[PDB]
Amino acid sequence: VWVVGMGIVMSLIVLAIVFGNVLVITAIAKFERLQTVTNYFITSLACADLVMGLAVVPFGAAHILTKTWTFGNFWCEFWTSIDVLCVTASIETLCVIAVDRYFAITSPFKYQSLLTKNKARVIILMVWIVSGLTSFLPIQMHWYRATHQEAINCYAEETCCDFFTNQAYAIASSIVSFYVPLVIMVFVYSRVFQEAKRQLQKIDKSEGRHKALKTLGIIMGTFTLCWLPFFIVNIVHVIQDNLIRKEVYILLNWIGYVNSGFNPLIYCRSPDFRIAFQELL
């Protein structure tokens, strides 16, 4: 009686993610006003979100819904690698877009000359290359396989597909994909908040007769709530077996996917973007 209940939600979230990515991608392309030296990272993030929503969400949702991986063996590793690459690229591009704002605010008078059109493409290409180096190479090549006899049949059986990894690969991927960008964001935004508070205090002392706090807290809360628990349990389950169950793991993995559907709605509020959106409707 509840088989179609999850399908409606999955279809709605897939359509929302697809529309949110496509609208931003076309809005950046059509109008020259929004084209700047900092919107390229937003374009890459939107493209990655669109690819993830188009390639990972439907196949995965079908996998849980029918409870059978009726597709072939070769497609399973390809799907897993696509998901890993998309997640890593999104995290890395978020870190880059935060570092860019840190450079913009913390040290002015050289940001205009330091950054240019050529540097942004090199940076994003290096980011995607680093993401791919840990995405296709360890997956397509038969590594990371579990030595314990369980799931060896799943590897052999074409019908059954499931995620089983070694401890070393899991911990290395978690470290190289999650924690370093989080620390970078924490330090960057602490410095930015300190600078903003200093400026506000200077203005208040100068002219006698928090928006920044809110706009930072919303982003930090969204990112932490969306992505923190998944890696928190990913680091621990491999370390000690039988600590967690599979249902909680897959539920956290799925709730981790909702973040991609929020980025267009939370990284676009400038009046130029509003005018561009109004120019379509």
Ligand X SMILES: CN[C@@H]1CCc2c(ccc(O)c2O)[C@H]1O
Placement of tokens 């300190």 in the chain? 194
Q: Is 100 annotated as a binding residue?
A: no
Minimum Å distance from CB 261 to ligand X? 15
Distance CA 148, CA 163 (A): 14
**Structure tokens given for 266:** 């939370």
Q: Is 83 annotated as a binding residue?
A: yes
Residues 6+ apart with CB under 8 A from 222: 259, 262, 266
Per-residue interface string for the shown chain with ligand X, residues 222-261, x marking contact by CB under 6 A: ------------x------------------x--------
Binding residue for ligand X, selected from 48, 87, 127, 276, defined by CB under 6 A: 87
**Total number of residues that touch ligand X (CB under 6 A):** 12
Minimum Å distance from CB 163 to ligand X? 5
Tell me the angle at which helices 3-30 and 57-66 cross, rounded to the nearest 10 degrees.
180
Reported residue count of the chain is 281
Residue number with CB closer to ligand X (12 or 64) = 64
83: contact with ligand X by CB under 6 A: yes
92: contact with ligand X by CB under 6 A: no
Binding residue for ligand X, selected from 81, 173, 260, 263, defined by CB under 6 A: 173
**CB count, 10 Å around CB of 57?**
21
Minimum Å distance from CB 220 to ligand X? 21
CB 35 within 8 A of CB 280: no
Minimum Å distance from CB 259 to ligand X? 12
Q: Is 88 annotated as a binding residue?
A: yes
Residue number with CB closer to ligand X (6 or 275) = 6
Q: Is 70 annotated as a binding residue?
A: no
Of all residues in the shown chain, the one whose CB is closest to ligand X is: 173
CB 93 within 8 A of CB 49: no
3-state secondary structure 157-208: CCCCCCCCCCHHHHHHHHHHHHHHHHHHHHHHHHHHHHHHHHHHHHHHHHCC
Query: Would you list which residues are annotated within the binding site for (S)-carazolol?
Result: 83, 173, 253
* Residues at the site binding ligand X, with contacts judged by CB under 6 A: 80, 83-84, 87-88, 163, 170, 173-174, 177, 234, 253
